[model samples]
Target: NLDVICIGAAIVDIPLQPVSKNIFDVDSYPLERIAMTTGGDAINEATIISRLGHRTALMSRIGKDAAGQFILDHCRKENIDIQSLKQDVSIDTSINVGLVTEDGERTFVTNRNGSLWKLNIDDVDFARFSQAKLLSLASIFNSPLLDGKALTEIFTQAKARQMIICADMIKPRLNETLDDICEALSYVDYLFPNFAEAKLLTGKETLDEIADCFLACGVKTVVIKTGKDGCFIKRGDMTMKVPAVAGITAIDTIGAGDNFASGFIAALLEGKNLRECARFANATAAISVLSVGATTGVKNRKLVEQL
Candidate 1:
């Protein structure tokens, strides 16, 4: 029994502040700030869900290195189960260098040829997967573990067990296309994607077209995250607009999207309706931006409710 099991990469994010093009110039500019934090889709969502009072676990691969150890320590601190986490002695842990501007927007530089990208079908723990009420797989386009046929098979088992399947999409490579994703949507109950990804997948000019396209693929719900503007959700004949939390300045927008997913899943576990779920999700994302790291600002469920 876990309320949710998150399957994706576990990464260490290094945030560098005052990221400017002047770094390439002759003068060396001292960065305004720098901090190391646990990141990656699974680590972020699992931490958020755990803090929001859910029984959660993370299923991902990491290197048997210091970075990996740091992630394990953080998970323990957050009370997230690590039974399904695997360590690969041969590779280095996945890391992303995020350069942040004064306004909190971030750009990432990463090396995908690390342990996280090496996740495969054999790495998954079927028993652990079967024990969760919800199976939430993040970074659908980027992880090797959920690629093509392997993804379909996992969803098949989840559906057979009557577990809710929720998925999130990330930025895909130039070679990746909508076809790599549509098949998996057929097995998902909810599909979470940022506005840009939804546009890319459906070639739709408006939010309505994007939602309708994914709904036609058999996803029972589609929530498109529109940063700052909030989220647009569609399920059956109901469509709703959930506004972003007001009056908070963002310090680092790095893990806002992941926090939103965690909030939505947490509310769903608590039997909240679609409108309430989206509102709570927005609040979580707002809290995440008030701090510099992904998991730093999300303190607890009471804090989110108060917001």
Candidate 2:
């Protein structure tokens, strides 16, 4: 049985590393090199979750093309089960080009319009979905995905099967509206959002305030990813904040959030206390940022213990 099922967009990322500062000035910048990797919020999360020792699967949509083939290859190498994933040959697969700056930040330009958004329900495996210990729905923007209704339905099904339901809103909000998300919160066990997104959706700045807002909507847990400040969790009157580890050079910030979810969810599955779960997630995410791609640098439980 799968420990977790991740639902979101999957993409083939082409990273362009610039040779010099002048590369941007010319019409065709001389490229240092390009590296292809498997990315997309949900896929990254599943990769980390599996690395962290969970039996994880993914439910996503991709086009029938080289990019989709690349994703399947990567997933196969990682040993992630993709039976619930779907492909539409009519549409071209989505692609992302990360233009890396000197500071190691990236300006991403992606082609994900109709391709990723068109998710069809019939393609998903409802029977297998109920067996996972946890169901993490990452990106809701995919067109075929149900907005609030789908989320509620999934959560209800998972709950009936005694599974935990969690959610993560990918960086882009193009797929689902805030009101729709809020309504879905009524059934979600955990709602994971970066600090800015939590503030934006809840119209509140303080973690406590935002937590209360989500809890009011019936969410049991609200985890706010605060970047270098680590993460904070709000579960009713019980709250906890864990700070990020020190002395780590972050190669990129892309996968930190998703890996943090992996770590946090992994700890939760192990029946660890909330405080330790928060700390474990912080360490896992800290290690992930030190590497190039999101999952490449993420540490396992043993490595986290060493740190």
Candidate 3:
């Protein structure tokens, strides 16, 4: 049986670090390295969780092209189950060109026409959901297909099978309000949103208020990621602020949140307490930023434990 099933996109990422200001105008720019890595929210979480000694599976859609093949190859090496992943002959796989700035902030050069936005409910296999005790939506709102209504359905079905659901989301592309996904949020056992997304979605000024927005909607717990300030977690009568891990220098910040979610889940599955889970997550995120690629850090469960 699988410990976790992470669903969402799988992407091929090419990161160019320290991108120059005049990059688009010049014929070529000199860079020490151009790295090709496996990315996409769910893919990152699946890779890290599997490496952390959990039986993890990824459910996503990719193209039947070389880029898609790269993700399949990577997951196989990472020991993540991909029997639920789909490859379509009709679409070209998503390939993102990540621009990493000197400050470690990064942006992506994405083609909307690619397969990144194409994964929908039709691709998910409920049988696979049955094999996992936990279901993680690597994110909500990033894809058009997994919108409020779709989420309500997905979360509802996952709940029917007694699976615990944890969710993370990006800034809304569709300008969705919390009410739009009320039923969906009701089914979520844990909701992980960065402070900005939380503030945007809640339209509230403070962490407590923002978490209250979701908790009122039937969510069991709300965990707000506050970047360098670390994280704030809240449940019925429980609340705490966890600080960032010290002494780890960052090379990039692309997948830190994804790594944090995986860390939290891995710990939760191991029967750790909520406070311990948050500490584990903080350390996991710190390790993630140490490497160029999202999955390059946290070599194994022991590495994170030792930190």
Candidate 4:
């Protein structure tokens, strides 16, 4: 089986730093730095996995525009399989402008016309899934066509093929809750969600409560990314809190969670134990934030394992 197949939006993110709060009121704004980088949950995973020397593939949609081409260019350069990528001329490729303030808070400028939420179940090629050892939805709530029912179908099929299903997610739009996705979660072998996203989705206060909710629904393992504190992982009756790498100043924390996901999956593919997987994952995430762009930091597996 192939190493990993990630399905989600593949976007171009333009990150501009140190912009003033009143910049929108100004006629023209200039920032100290602005650069385009490979983004999107699946794209970040494929980039990291490929750089780590894994057989990576991307299954997603993008517009036939410059932004889409940029993603294709980067994927080809990294030798990630894009045979399953679909380019649509109708919609605009997703382009999110990350506006970073002086205080390190960030805001994203988005458009409704973008291709962020256009992926549907039909866009997936099951043939690719049959060949992959792992299936990453690259987020549950990010795509409108991939609601709970749709995810259940896809995860069921992947499980039938003996593939481990891993999932990550964004904040729910409106009041979308775990009840809707419970069936899908039941099939997920591993679930990764950031602290804030899970808190809002589950309406739970503590980390154990949040993870337990997912575990109760039959998710084999729940790994909550806890930023500076590290990750809290739960599998059935077992729970572990892995601390983050200490004393490293983060230059930009753009794709930390996605990096962490890919790192964990990569370590799993390498036959690492759960503790060792989280340890390697923490190291990979720490390396990513030491640079500006999302995929710019960890150059290779050697660099990450050294940390």
Candidate 5:
């Protein structure tokens, strides 16, 4: 049995460094470097959990292309189970082009003209929900095909099987709204969203208001990520602020949130309390930004512990 089963889009990330201030300008600026890596929230999270000594599985669909092969090969190397992973030949794989600045800030250009969003609820094997301790749904808004009714039904079954559910959201593009996200949260035990998404969902200006909004929506716990400022978590009357890790020179901020989720879930699986989980989560994300790739800096749990 696996500790977690992560589900969402599968993508290939191409990171270009030191992007020109004006691509629209007549002047040209040289890119410092470029690297290709396998990404997507589910893929990154499952890989990190597996690396940190958890038996994890990834469930997502990818197109039959070079980009898809990169993901398949990477998962095998990472030892993440891919028995339920799917491949579609009709479309190409999705890709994100990230432009990185000196301080590790990134601007992304994405192309979803592929099979990444083709995942239907029927593609999921319901039996696996019973076999896993947790079901993590990453990028809830990015999956255009997985609608509210389908998500509610899936989460309902997971709940019936006594599996804990964890969720995170991306900014929506294909007509998904706050109501749809709220529908999914009704079944989630832990809800993780960055500051912007929380504000976007609740129309609230502060993290306190955002956390309250999600808790009132039936989420058992709410963790809002604030990048360099660290994270804020609330559950019941227990609330805490976990600061960001210190003394790390960042090469990229890609996959930081995904790695944070891995660390938090790892601690939770070990029966650690909420505050301890948040500390580990910050450490995990701190290490992730030290390198160019998502999983590059996170070699093992020892590194996280050292931080």
Candidate 6:
């Protein structure tokens, strides 16, 4: 148990396809088209938050394998408490294959094999949630990983301990409807979603209406991530639009939003008001998009403080 607990599946992501115009295929080769490392949103957020000087904790399961061992060691070296991160021996270690195009767009082919579909919420130790100053969750689709009732439970329990709560939305599947997806958003304090996801979730064409819909859902703050366009944050009656970091030689967009959520949460915990927190997040995410690896180029607290 620590000040913050990130609960989700932990996997070693191996990005395929090189950063070039040539469409190198991984199908014919004995080796990978590209070599890289990555984890899911919750893991990336936890890593960045701990690097930003928070007393963080991660609550998730790792397979009893080499990849799992490597990730656990990485977290330990970064000083992120792995007190509640468990080992699930029955499942195989999950991996994500990133297929990138010439312009840096990625199509992920995942081996969820035993990952997302097998999320056991009972594995999470609720006691860790009690000790946290904030509990952050990332829900992919309407999956049972962390849905409405669980959000309610976590939020209420955290509220009793005077802890804040935030949540992020994962990408939707091909045919999922937005209306059905937004039903579980009733208990969060802060909402993080991309602009497109916001429009789909809020049923609004503009940012103002989208923000209003989120606020009406009992969320006090909503930050709509617009990628290179920056972020739009709405806090009560106050609306702030924070621009992207000036120089963005972006390369990949995979974990930018996750990094943004981490930076924003870290800033919020550090007492940054609405607009400042958005700027901090924007800068961190902007820097993150410039590199091939997911977490590289993400700045820490001291660097963010200078801006």
Note the Cα lDDT for every prediction shown. Answer: 0.84, 0.78, 0.87, 0.87, 0.84, 0.72
lDDT accuracy of residue 153 in candidate 3: 86
Q: What is candidate 4's CA lDDT for residue 10?
A: 89
Query: RMSD in Å for candidate 4, one decimal?
Result: 1.6
- Residue-level lDDT of model 1, residues 1-307, one tens digit each, is 4899888888888878767776888666776566677888888899899889898888888999999999999999989999889799988888888777767677888886876778776767887766889989877876755676888888887888788999988877545666766787789988888888778778897998889888887789999888877999987788889889889889777678899999999999999988899999999999888996677788888878997
TM-score of 1: 0.92
Better TM-score candidate (3, 6)? 3
Candidate 3 lDDT over residue span 1-307, tens digit each: 5899898999888988888577888898889988777888999999899988898988889999989999999999989898888899999888999887887777888978777788888877887677889999988887778888888889888988999899998887767778888778889998998888788788998999899989998999898888887799998788899888878779777789999999999989989988899998998999989886688887897878888
* Models, CA RMSD each: 2.1, 2.5, 1.8, 1.6, 2.4, 3.1
How do the candidates rank by TM-score, highest first?
A: 4, 3, 1, 5, 2, 6
Candidate 4, 1-307: lDDT as tens digits:
3688999988888877777678889899877667787788889999998888788889998999988999999999988999999899999998899777778898988866778778888778887777888888898888777888889989888988999889999987546789999989999988998899798878899999988889989999999889987889988879899999898799878789889998999988888999998998899999999997678898889989898
Residue pairs whose backbone atoms clash in candidate 3: none
Q: Which candidate number has the best TM-score?
A: 4
* Local error of candidate 2 at residue 12 (angstroms): 1.1
Clash statistics: count for each candidate: 0, 4, 0, 0, 0, 0
Model 6 C-alpha lDDT per residue in residues 186-243, reported as the tens digit of each score: 5577888778876775678999887887787677788889876789888777888888
Candidate 4, residue 178: Cα displacement in angstroms equals: 1.0
TM-score of 4: 0.95
Candidate 4 lDDT for residue 4: 89
* Residue 87 in candidate 3, Cα distance off native in Å: 0.5
Cα TM-score per model = 0.92, 0.90, 0.94, 0.95, 0.91, 0.87
Residue 26 displacement in candidate 4 (angstroms): 4.1
Model 5, position 146: C-alpha lDDT score: 76
Which ten-residue region of model 3 has the weakest summed lDDT?
172-181
lDDT of candidate 4 at residue 119, scale 0 to 100: 85
